Design a protein around this nucleic acid. Sequence first.
DNA 1: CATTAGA
DNA 2: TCTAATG
Length: 327
Amino acid sequence: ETLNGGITDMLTELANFEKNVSQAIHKYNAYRKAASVIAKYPHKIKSGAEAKKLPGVGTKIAEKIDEFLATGKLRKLEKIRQDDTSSSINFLTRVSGIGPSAARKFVDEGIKTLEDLRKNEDKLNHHQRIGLKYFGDFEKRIPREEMLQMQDIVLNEVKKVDSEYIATVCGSFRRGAESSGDMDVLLTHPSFTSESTKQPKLLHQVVEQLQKVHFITDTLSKGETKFMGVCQLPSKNDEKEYPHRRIDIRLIPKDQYYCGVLYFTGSDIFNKNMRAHALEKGFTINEYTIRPLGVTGVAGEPLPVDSEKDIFDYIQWKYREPKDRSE
DNA sequence: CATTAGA
DNA sequence: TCTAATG
Ligand SMILES: [Cr+3]
Ligand code: NA
Ligand code: NA
């Protein structure tokens, strides 16, 4: 956690670098299980060999470890960090829309900077177009103070279109969290469950509403179940406008909201921990349901959910307020 | 790990 | 169809 830290992080940087700048998934994979195992190691790694004894620790990695332990740096590391080319892919990548692949190509053609991106907007696709447009606002945190405002709006139109809509803004925001990155609104409706052959419009109607009133301003990607866009809080009485924000609304078969909700609420650990728990307690939990476990090793059969509760109950746990789902 | 764009 | 990018 801190005794193995430097090693891990160097490794992760290492790992990372392969995966993007280079097209080396394998090495990249190498760096991770290693960085994975060495992390759990109960003692201060003190030399490569020591490290080496470890499963996943090759001769190569070890060699790096020594040089890092011996000298507070790493060459390949300093050299990467420096390397303008790699620097660029690492950068371009920030654009929502851009990924490693396209990052390398942009470079290959010469677009290293944001500006280049500008002059060559032609070369970018609508997603990345919006990516480039709101570059700044995309990086910004979302003050819960605003979360309340957006959340507020979203609920109204939802209900305003059809009262049957249920809707939750999941994420850190649900978890209290002073700020959040993007807004996750979960959604469902009775008339839409497991079997009941969809009702696309379901999603569509709202998307239309929120836009209608100018909440949603940009569409990054709308599907029959997953809408992904840009929104922005009304700019009051001029002098202060709102930063354009990332937003995702997802349609759900009401017969699996809860789990889904539970799930997206997090945290990463609470889930996991909660998940591991249901196991002993003879169950299984995942993004959409909770099934009773069978001794034959495994088994099916989806239990019935009415609220975050039922689930809690099932595994016979103590209801954890979102606020406290932190771990 | 599943859902969308695009080509 | 597959291949990228988001989550
Ligand atoms: Cr989010
Ligand atoms: Na080994
Ligand atoms: Na990106």
